[PDB]
Symmetry: D2
């Protein structure tokens, strides 16, 4: 149930394929929906989750460089998939920007996001 | 630079390869260091970093399932590689465990890890 | 504005008074709602926020010890109050438990809470 | 409780705290510069009856970055544990939230870690 298209609250889309070996691969698209707004995503997920109502643990990374732009940063999302009619991926995220050593204390933003199969 | 064998403060080993396409691929070997403790890692990095002294942003994910055990959890690391002599990768991490909706609020741990090429 | 009784999505109640000197003081009441689940809270907030439509930064702590029990843990919430129609405080939080050295890598939980003056 | 006194981080900041019998933490945070313009009030909570099995003492505290001389419209919360001994330390994780507009709330909060010791 993870393979497919997921949308967040702020306009982004990510298309992902969950491979049988635990791999997540796809593309993350920023609000602009532009070719310049498409980035590669890669991650991992628990390919044999509990069937007791627990979610399916997963994570993925996007580095914010493509052929058109580079923000010298990477985001990682860590969270869980929950299936059913109200299916959702609930995540918390870390965004790290390349900095000098003196500025390393403010290198990393933290936040959360929920994705759904419909907008 | 990034490609090689790295060690965290606690005794774990991260064997990584950085591809020209921005990809990170490798294997994580927990403190014990036997086969049952090896897990697949995948991630992404900024393959064209700034030239002004800043680090190179990167992230990766490990899902804690292999052929021998499954913890129904995944860790994502978010940070930056700082080169020179005494190369290091400084990270913050998020470990999420699959949980029921009732326990979702305690699903994610956070910490920090620093990796070096010297055990 | 910030002073009052606020509720999170999971049933808890936050009773707070915002002092003129930037002090936050109050009581946190867990979902159960009985006296065994009342805890003291203390914090700080920006008492002179920007006038450009930014939120008001704030934070507070609750150690999870009262006269009835002691979880050997403490939670800090960091966030901003956003005024308006349906006023809210958006926060992220860190809960650290006391642990030994060998287990300090799993001491700290991270999460997020949204509070409103209207109870779910 | 071992906690009262002066604590230093590696980046050059100092904090002076008093640990109250009731679980109160009160004090002053002094940034690297060292002058009055770099002094701010701190308040928090700690576990006043920690376990005796060698586990750390959970605590947290908040500073809002406003004094009489300046206002950065932000606040930090530190969540951690005190570990006693000859080389006592407070190990923490922190969140720094800045007040922002709603359109920028997604980049409102930084996370990091810091360790404080009794010797500079």
């Amino acid at each position: 149930g993870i393979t497919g298209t997921w949308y967040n609250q702020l306009g982004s889309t990510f298309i992902v394929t969950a491979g049988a070996d635990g791999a997540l691969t796809g593309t993350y698209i920023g609000a602009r929906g532009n070719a310049e707004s498409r980035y590669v995503l890669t991650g991992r997920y628990d390919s044999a989750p509990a069937t007791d109502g627990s979610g399916t643990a997963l994570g993925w990374t996007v580095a914010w460089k493509n052929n058109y732009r580079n923000a010298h940063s990477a985001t990682t999302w860590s969270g869980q998939y929950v299936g059913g009619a109200e299916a959702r991926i609930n995540t918390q995220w870390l965004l790290t920007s390349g900095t000098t050593e003196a500025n390393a204390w403010k290198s990393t933003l933290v936040g959360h996001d929920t994705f759904t199969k419909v907008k």
